[PDB]
């Protein structure tokens, strides 16, 4: 019904973008094993 759950194309994009940001801090923070 109205209280149903519908996934939108955009909402999904925002989810991927959020995750991508986390990875950045992963590879970046990792690339500084000696720098940091």
């Amino acid at each position: 019904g109205s209280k149903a759950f519908i996934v939108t194309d955009e909402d999904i994009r925002k989810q991927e973008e959020r995750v991508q940001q986390v990875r950045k801090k992963l590879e970046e923070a990792l690339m500084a094993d000696i720098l940091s």
């Binding site: 996934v7 999904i12 989810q15 995750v19 990875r23 923070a29």
Partner: protein, 43 residues
């Protein structure tokens, strides 16, 4: 400065990253699962 603490955070974020992504990939399948033949399951 507990250098190990900094590395620990990276490892922790790495694990959650995999789980966080897993759900994302699954969600994508759900979208394509509702396109073909209705959506069979309602849940």
């Amino acid at each position: 400065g507990s250098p190990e603490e900094r590395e620990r955070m990276i490892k922790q974020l790495k694990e959650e990253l995999r789980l966080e992504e897993a759900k994302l990939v699954l969600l994508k399948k759900l979208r394509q699962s509702q396109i073909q033949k209705e959506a069979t399951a309602q849940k």
